[PDB]
Design a protein around this ligand. Structure first.
Ligand SMILES: [Mg+2]
Lengths: 40, 97, 109, 43
């Protein structure tokens, strides 16, 4: 009960935690020219 | 053949293909992303800026309505047709008029 | 009973077609070239001039594109427009052949 | 690495290689104003 050699690694983090509305996935625009989307 | 590697030819032979520099009056496809409208790609007549200090694509402010563009840092693509078939099609179909 | 596949089916090669030209008095499509058709005619003629260079145009021009445009405008272009109307299941390919030297040209110069 | 993972997403085979294309003979630069150019002209 005191052993820590086989503790879950994912339990050291904070425990616990379809389309992204903000991701430009269907927009085919170059990543070097994204300033065209600036609100201006 | 490169043009520096040949200098003994007095002229060109009929049938050769010469790749020449882009001059004033050539048509060019001019595009701003995202291309949401049909006017997002238009064909413009090229004016070559002889000042070596200029690196920008310059256009009239009244042409910005085609591309939804402005001059706050937008970048636009430009390719010049070289083949005859695409260079005919640029003039007759894709001209911004 | 539905037995093993036979050679009568399994053909990948589509059978050849017969080009059926609609008689000139029964043509339904417009007698005016579309902008697409005129552009295609000029482009094809200009490329072929870049290949051959033989034209019957009286005036002299320094570009294949100018020669092709003037051939279209002066009704001297050696090309035809074939408008494919239908492909019949019995093999026929019904098309309309249009002579661009006697059609209306939409382009301007 | 798998054969069928090459297809699906925006960076996949269909959307990146077939529906779009890297091309030669093209240029890009910042755009600028010029009131001496006609509407159908580009500097
Ligand atoms: Mg901007």
């Amino acid at each position: 009960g005191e052993d820590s050699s086989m503790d879950d690694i994912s339990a050291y983090s904070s425990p616990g935690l379809l389309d992204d509305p903000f991701s430009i996935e269907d927009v085919d625009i170059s990543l070097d020219v994204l300033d065209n989307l600036a609100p201006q | 053949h490169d043009i520096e590697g040949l200098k003994q030819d007095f002229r060109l032979e009929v049938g050769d293909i010469l790749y020449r520099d882009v001059v004033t009056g050539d048509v060019a496809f001019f595009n701003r992303q995202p291309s949401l409208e049909r006017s997002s790609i238009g064909v413009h007549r090229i004016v070559v800026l002889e000042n070596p200090k200029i690196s920008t694509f310059q256009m009239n402010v009244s042409a910005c309505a085609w591309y939804n563009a402005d001059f706050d840092g937008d970048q636009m693509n430009l390719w010049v047709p070289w083949s005859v078939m695409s260079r005919v099609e640029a003039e007759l179909l894709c001209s911004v008029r | 009973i539905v037995e093993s596949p036979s050679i009568c089916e399994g053909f990948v090669q589509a059978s050849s077609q017969t080009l059926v030209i609609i008689p000139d008095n029964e043509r339904i499509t417009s007698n005016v070239l579309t902008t697409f058709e005129a552009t295609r005619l000029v482009a094809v003629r200009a490329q072929q001039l870049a290949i051959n260079g033989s034209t019957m145009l009286k005036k002299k021009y320094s570009s294949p594109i100018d020669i092709a445009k003037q051939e279209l405008f002066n009704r001297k272009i050696p090309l035809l427009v074939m408008r494919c109307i239908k492909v019949t299941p019995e093999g026929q390919k019904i098309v309309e052949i249009w002579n661009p030297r006697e059609m209306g040209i939409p382009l301007l110069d | 690495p798998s054969i069928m993972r090459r297809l699906p997403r925006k960076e996949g085979r269909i959307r990146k290689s077939l529906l779009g294309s890297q091309v030669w003979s093209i240029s890009r630069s910042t755009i600028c104003g010029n009131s001496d150019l006609h509407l159908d002209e580009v500097g």
